[PDB]
Amino acid sequence: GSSGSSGNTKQLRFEDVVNQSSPKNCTVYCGGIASGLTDQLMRQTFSPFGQIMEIRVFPEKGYSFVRFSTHESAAHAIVSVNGTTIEGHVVKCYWGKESPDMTSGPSSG
Numbered sequence: 001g002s003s004g005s006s007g008n009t010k011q012l013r014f015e016d017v018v019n020q021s022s023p024k025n026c027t028v029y030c031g032g033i034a035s036g037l038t039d040q041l042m043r044q045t046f047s048p049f050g051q052i053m054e055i056r057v058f059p060e061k062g063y064s065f066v067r068f069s070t071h072e073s074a075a076h077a078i079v080s081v082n083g084t085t086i087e088g089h090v091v092k093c094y095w096g097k098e099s100p101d102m103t104s105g106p107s108s109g
Contacts, residue, residue, distance in 0.1 A: 012082055018075040020095050026074040027096025028081070031063035036087040042066055045086065049077035065096055 021027075030042060037059040046052050046066050050073025056065035068074040074095075081093035 010083075012079050014075055014079050017079050017095075018071055021097065023071045025095075025098065026068050026071040028066040028068065028074050028078055029063065029094040029096040030066055030081060030091050031094075032089045032091030033064070033086055034059075034062045034089060036089065037062070037064060041086070045081075046077050049073065049080070067096065 028046065030045075033041070037057045039055050039057050042055050042057060042064050043052060046068075051069045053067045053069055054065065058064060066074075066077075068077070078093040078095070081091060084091055084093075
């Protein structure tokens with residue numbers, strides 16, 4: 001028989017992901033692919049994971065966007081995709097947050 005145990009606390013808990021960001025804004029930032037980024041890919045990949053609203057593939061930056069109609073579905077695909085290898089390329093699933101358009105006044109801490 002074989003053995004191999006040396007891990008503790010990994011990935012992201014569904015309860016943690018389904019809260020990180022407001023329930024109103026549900027986005028999934030999938031970054032990793034470089035020589036295999038295609039709308040059909042992300043669509044088919046998240047297709048089942050849940051319902052997809054908008055998809056943006058950036059084969060020049062090495063990342064893509066995927067927003068769901070709900071927070072749950074998004075969290076599911078995230079908790080999973082978060083640490084998966086597509087076509088031999090590790091991808092990262094995050095909560096696509098809208099960039100700050102207006103704010104004025106930097107900070108630090």
